[PDB]
Each structure stands twice: as C-alpha cells, then as structure tokens.
Design a protein around this motif. Sequence first.
Motif, PDB file in Angstrom:
ATOM      1  N   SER A  35       0.831  -1.211   0.000  1.00 40.58           N
ATOM      2  CA  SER A  35       0.000   0.000   0.000  1.00 40.58           C
ATOM      3  C   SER A  35       0.858   1.251   0.000  1.00 40.58           C
ATOM      4  O   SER A  35       0.318   2.338  -0.224  1.00 40.58           O
ATOM      5  CB  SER A  35      -0.937   0.049   1.224  1.00 40.58           C
ATOM      6  N   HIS A  36       2.157   1.118   0.283  1.00 44.08           N
ATOM      7  CA  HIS A  36       3.189   2.170   0.429  1.00 44.08           C
ATOM      8  C   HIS A  36       3.691   2.675  -0.893  1.00 44.08           C
ATOM      9  O   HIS A  36       4.584   3.508  -0.894  1.00 44.08           O
ATOM     10  CB  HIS A  36       4.409   1.783   1.350  1.00 44.08           C
ATOM     11  N   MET A  37       3.111   2.215  -1.984  1.00 46.75           N
ATOM     12  CA  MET A  37       3.879   2.252  -3.200  1.00 46.75           C
ATOM     13  C   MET A  37       3.097   2.670  -4.435  1.00 46.75           C
ATOM     14  O   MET A  37       2.121   2.034  -4.846  1.00 46.75           O
ATOM     15  CB  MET A  37       4.569   0.923  -3.417  1.00 46.75           C
ATOM     16  N   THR A  38       3.525   3.765  -5.042  1.00 49.03           N
ATOM     17  CA  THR A  38       2.803   4.217  -6.246  1.00 49.03           C
ATOM     18  C   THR A  38       2.959   3.200  -7.350  1.00 49.03           C
ATOM     19  O   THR A  38       3.888   2.368  -7.308  1.00 49.03           O
ATOM     20  CB  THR A  38       3.351   5.560  -6.782  1.00 49.03           C
ATOM     21  N   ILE A  39       2.100   3.269  -8.370  1.00 50.82           N
ATOM     22  CA  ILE A  39       2.337   2.425  -9.544  1.00 50.82           C
ATOM     23  C   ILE A  39       3.724   2.692 -10.100  1.00 50.82           C
ATOM     24  O   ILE A  39       4.426   1.763 -10.469  1.00 50.82           O
ATOM     25  CB  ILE A  39       1.238   2.620 -10.631  1.00 50.82           C
ATOM     26  N   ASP A  40       4.116   3.957 -10.167  1.00 53.09           N
ATOM     27  CA  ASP A  40       5.385   4.274 -10.769  1.00 53.09           C
ATOM     28  C   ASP A  40       6.530   3.633  -9.997  1.00 53.09           C
ATOM     29  O   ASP A  40       7.483   3.106 -10.619  1.00 53.09           O
ATOM     30  CB  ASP A  40       5.579   5.787 -10.820  1.00 53.09           C
ATOM     31  N   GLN A  41       6.486   3.740  -8.667  1.00 48.90           N
ATOM     32  CA  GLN A  41       7.541   3.124  -7.842  1.00 48.90           C
ATOM     33  C   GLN A  41       7.541   1.618  -8.034  1.00 48.90           C
ATOM     34  O   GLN A  41       8.619   0.969  -8.070  1.00 48.90           O
ATOM     35  CB  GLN A  41       7.310   3.450  -6.376  1.00 48.90           C
ATOM     36  N   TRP A  42       6.343   1.048  -8.081  1.00 49.45           N
ATOM     37  CA  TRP A  42       6.206  -0.410  -8.233  1.00 49.45           C
ATOM     38  C   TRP A  42       6.805  -0.884  -9.585  1.00 49.45           C
ATOM     39  O   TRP A  42       7.517  -1.909  -9.644  1.00 49.45           O
ATOM     40  CB  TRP A  42       4.713  -0.750  -8.189  1.00 49.45           C
ATOM     41  N   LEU A  43       6.515  -0.160 -10.669  1.00 50.34           N
ATOM     42  CA  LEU A  43       7.091  -0.545 -11.979  1.00 50.34           C
ATOM     43  C   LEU A  43       8.610  -0.416 -11.952  1.00 50.34           C
ATOM     44  O   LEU A  43       9.308  -1.215 -12.581  1.00 50.34           O
ATOM     45  CB  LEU A  43       6.485   0.324 -13.091  1.00 50.34           C
ATOM     46  N   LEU A  44       9.136   0.620 -11.288  1.00 51.99           N
ATOM     47  CA  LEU A  44      10.590   0.764 -11.199  1.00 51.99           C
ATOM     48  C   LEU A  44      11.173  -0.435 -10.412  1.00 51.99           C
ATOM     49  O   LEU A  44      12.222  -1.002 -10.805  1.00 51.99           O
ATOM     50  CB  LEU A  44      10.972   2.091 -10.519  1.00 51.99           C
ATOM     51  N   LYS A  45      10.540  -0.801  -9.290  1.00 60.37           N
ATOM     52  CA  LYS A  45      11.079  -1.903  -8.451  1.00 60.37           C
ATOM     53  C   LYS A  45      11.063  -3.206  -9.255  1.00 60.37           C
ATOM     54  O   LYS A  45      11.988  -4.014  -9.200  1.00 60.37           O
ATOM     55  CB  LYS A  45      10.205  -2.079  -7.190  1.00 60.37           C
ATOM     56  N   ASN A  46       9.989  -3.424  -9.998  1.00 64.76           N
ATOM     57  CA  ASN A  46       9.910  -4.619 -10.850  1.00 64.76           C
ATOM     58  C   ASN A  46      10.969  -4.614 -11.958  1.00 64.76           C
ATOM     59  O   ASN A  46      11.566  -5.649 -12.254  1.00 64.76           O
ATOM     60  CB  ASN A  46       8.520  -4.719 -11.440  1.00 64.76           C
ATOM     61  N   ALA A  47      11.229  -3.460 -12.581  1.00 71.38           N
ATOM     62  CA  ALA A  47      12.293  -3.396 -13.567  1.00 71.38           C
ATOM     63  C   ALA A  47      13.649  -3.760 -12.948  1.00 71.38           C
ATOM     64  O   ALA A  47      14.456  -4.446 -13.576  1.00 71.38           O
ATOM     65  CB  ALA A  47      12.350  -1.966 -14.176  1.00 71.38           C
ATOM     66  N   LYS A  48      13.895  -3.264 -11.734  1.00 75.13           N
ATOM     67  CA  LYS A  48      15.175  -3.553 -11.077  1.00 75.13           C
ATOM     68  C   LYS A  48      15.316  -5.062 -10.857  1.00 75.13           C
ATOM     69  O   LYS A  48      16.368  -5.656 -11.160  1.00 75.13           O
ATOM     70  CB  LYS A  48      15.306  -2.789  -9.748  1.00 75.13           C
ATOM     71  N   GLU A  49      14.281  -5.674 -10.305  1.00 73.63           N
ATOM     72  CA  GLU A  49      14.324  -7.106 -10.065  1.00 73.63           C
ATOM     73  C   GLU A  49      14.499  -7.928 -11.340  1.00 73.63           C
ATOM     74  O   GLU A  49      15.284  -8.888 -11.369  1.00 73.63           O
ATOM     75  CB  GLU A  49      13.067  -7.507  -9.311  1.00 73.63           C
ATOM     76  N   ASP A  50      13.794  -7.550 -12.397  1.00 74.60           N
ATOM     77  CA  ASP A  50      13.904  -8.255 -13.655  1.00 74.60           C
ATOM     78  C   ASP A  50      15.304  -8.096 -14.260  1.00 74.60           C
ATOM     79  O   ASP A  50      15.843  -9.050 -14.869  1.00 74.60           O
ATOM     80  CB  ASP A  50      12.885  -7.730 -14.654  1.00 74.60           C
ATOM     81  N   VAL A  98      13.278   3.538 -15.130  1.00 74.25           N
ATOM     82  CA  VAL A  98      13.352   2.260 -15.832  1.00 74.25           C
ATOM     83  C   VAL A  98      14.400   2.305 -16.954  1.00 74.25           C
ATOM     84  O   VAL A  98      15.095   1.305 -17.194  1.00 74.25           O
ATOM     85  CB  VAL A  98      11.962   1.848 -16.349  1.00 74.25           C
ATOM     86  N   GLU A  99      14.504   3.441 -17.664  1.00 78.07           N
ATOM     87  CA  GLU A  99      15.492   3.523 -18.708  1.00 78.07           C
ATOM     88  C   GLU A  99      16.924   3.450 -18.152  1.00 78.07           C
ATOM     89  O   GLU A  99      17.810   2.900 -18.826  1.00 78.07           O
ATOM     90  CB  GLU A  99      15.343   4.804 -19.535  1.00 78.07           C
ATOM     91  N   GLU A 100      17.193   4.047 -16.980  1.00 82.99           N
ATOM     92  CA  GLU A 100      18.504   3.886 -16.366  1.00 82.99           C
ATOM     93  C   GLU A 100      18.762   2.422 -16.020  1.00 82.99           C
ATOM     94  O   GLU A 100      19.860   1.914 -16.254  1.00 82.99           O
ATOM     95  CB  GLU A 100      18.612   4.743 -15.098  1.00 82.99           C
ATOM     96  N   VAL A 101      17.761   1.740 -15.467  1.00 76.45           N
ATOM     97  CA  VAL A 101      17.907   0.296 -15.186  1.00 76.45           C
ATOM     98  C   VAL A 101      18.270  -0.453 -16.479  1.00 76.45           C
ATOM     99  O   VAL A 101      19.219  -1.279 -16.480  1.00 76.45           O
ATOM    100  CB  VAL A 101      16.622  -0.269 -14.579  1.00 76.45           C
ATOM    101  N   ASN A 102      17.551  -0.162 -17.570  1.00 76.64           N
ATOM    102  CA  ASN A 102      17.791  -0.874 -18.822  1.00 76.64           C
ATOM    103  C   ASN A 102      19.216  -0.636 -19.294  1.00 76.64           C
ATOM    104  O   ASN A 102      19.875  -1.540 -19.830  1.00 76.64           O
ATOM    105  CB  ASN A 102      16.857  -0.372 -19.943  1.00 76.64           C
ATOM    106  N   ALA A 103      19.656   0.624 -19.202  1.00 75.68           N
ATOM    107  CA  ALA A 103      20.976   0.983 -19.720  1.00 75.68           C
ATOM    108  C   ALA A 103      22.073   0.326 -18.870  1.00 75.68           C
ATOM    109  O   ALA A 103      23.053  -0.194 -19.437  1.00 75.68           O
ATOM    110  CB  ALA A 103      21.159   2.498 -19.717  1.00 75.68           C
ATOM    111  N   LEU A 104      21.934   0.365 -17.537  1.00 78.04           N
ATOM    112  CA  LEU A 104      22.892  -0.315 -16.673  1.00 78.04           C
ATOM    113  C   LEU A 104      22.962  -1.797 -17.043  1.00 78.04           C
ATOM    114  O   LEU A 104      24.065  -2.367 -17.252  1.00 78.04           O
ATOM    115  CB  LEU A 104      22.502  -0.126 -15.192  1.00 78.04           C
ATOM    116  N   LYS A 105      21.795  -2.431 -17.089  1.00 77.25           N
ATOM    117  CA  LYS A 105      21.727  -3.858 -17.422  1.00 77.25           C
ATOM    118  C   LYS A 105      22.376  -4.155 -18.779  1.00 77.25           C
ATOM    119  O   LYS A 105      23.214  -5.102 -18.922  1.00 77.25           O
ATOM    120  CB  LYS A 105      20.264  -4.314 -17.462  1.00 77.25           C
TER     121      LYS A 105
END
Length: 61
Positions: free
Chosen positions: A6-21, A46-53
């Motif tokens: 409940s602590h978590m915006t959709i945006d934060q949630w999508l970012l956390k999922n991108a990090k895990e993936d 998410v784009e920073e996650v993609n680029a790092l990965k």
Amino acid sequence: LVPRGSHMTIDQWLLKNAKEDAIAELKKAGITSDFYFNAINKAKTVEEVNALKNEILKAHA
C-alpha cells in the motif's frame, strides 16, 4: 512480479519490478557482483535500469 504494498505508487512499483527483472537477467548471464546489482538498485528510472543492465551484459559477453 514484486507485489505492490500500500506504500507504493504504480510508478515506484514498476521501477522496483524493472530492477528485479534486470538483476534476474544479469544472474542468468552469470553475473554475481553485488556492486553491479547495487547500481541497478540505485537507479531512478526504468530507462537507467535498462541501460545499466545492457552495458553490463555487453561488457560480459
């Protein structure tokens, strides 16, 4: 998916999922570096996650 507290915006949630993936993809490729995983976990978009990965995968290929 990481589930969404409940602590978590959709945006934060999508970012956390991108990090895990991304970390899961790095692990599949044989990367075991916490230093590299931490960099992904510090990313703010998410784009920073993609680029790092993508750069880590390219460097390791």
